[PDB]
């Protein structure tokens, strides 16, 4: 049995961290109340939203 490295634990840690980051993103989305918060998510939607905000003002 290979004990110098724990590949199963490495895979578990990787999936755990890459789901922790997305749960953090979902938490920030829930706290802010809008789906488009940080640039990168739906850039076109962000542009149209900015144009509509200008229009409503």
């Amino acid at each position: 049995m290979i004990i110098n490295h724990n590949l199963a634990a490495i895979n578990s840690h990787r999936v755990l961290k890459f789901q922790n980051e997305e749960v953090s993103k979902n938490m920030e989305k829930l706290s802010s109340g809008m789906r488009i918060n940080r640039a990168g998510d739906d850039a076109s939607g962000l542009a149209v939203s900015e144009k509509m905000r200008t229009q409503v003002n």
């Binding site: 149209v48 509509m52 229009q55």
Partner: protein
């Protein structure tokens, strides 16, 4: 009466949804300018067309 037709053409030439004019006639049946479609499907050609006639 003149003021009211002035207002009518003002609405016709100033109505705007997304920095595009709607009542001018750019989406009429014989629209020589452009045509607009509503992609309402998850596939390549699942779309539909809507006509907005001239309202000037």
């Amino acid at each position: 009466v003149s003021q009211l037709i002035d207002e009518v053409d003002r609405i016709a030439s100033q109505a705007e949804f997304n920095k595009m004019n709607l009542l001018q006639g750019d989406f009429a049946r014989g629209s020589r300018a452009t045509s607009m479609w509503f992609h309402i499907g998850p596939n390549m050609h699942q779309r539909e067309r809507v006509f907005i006639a001239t309202m000037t």
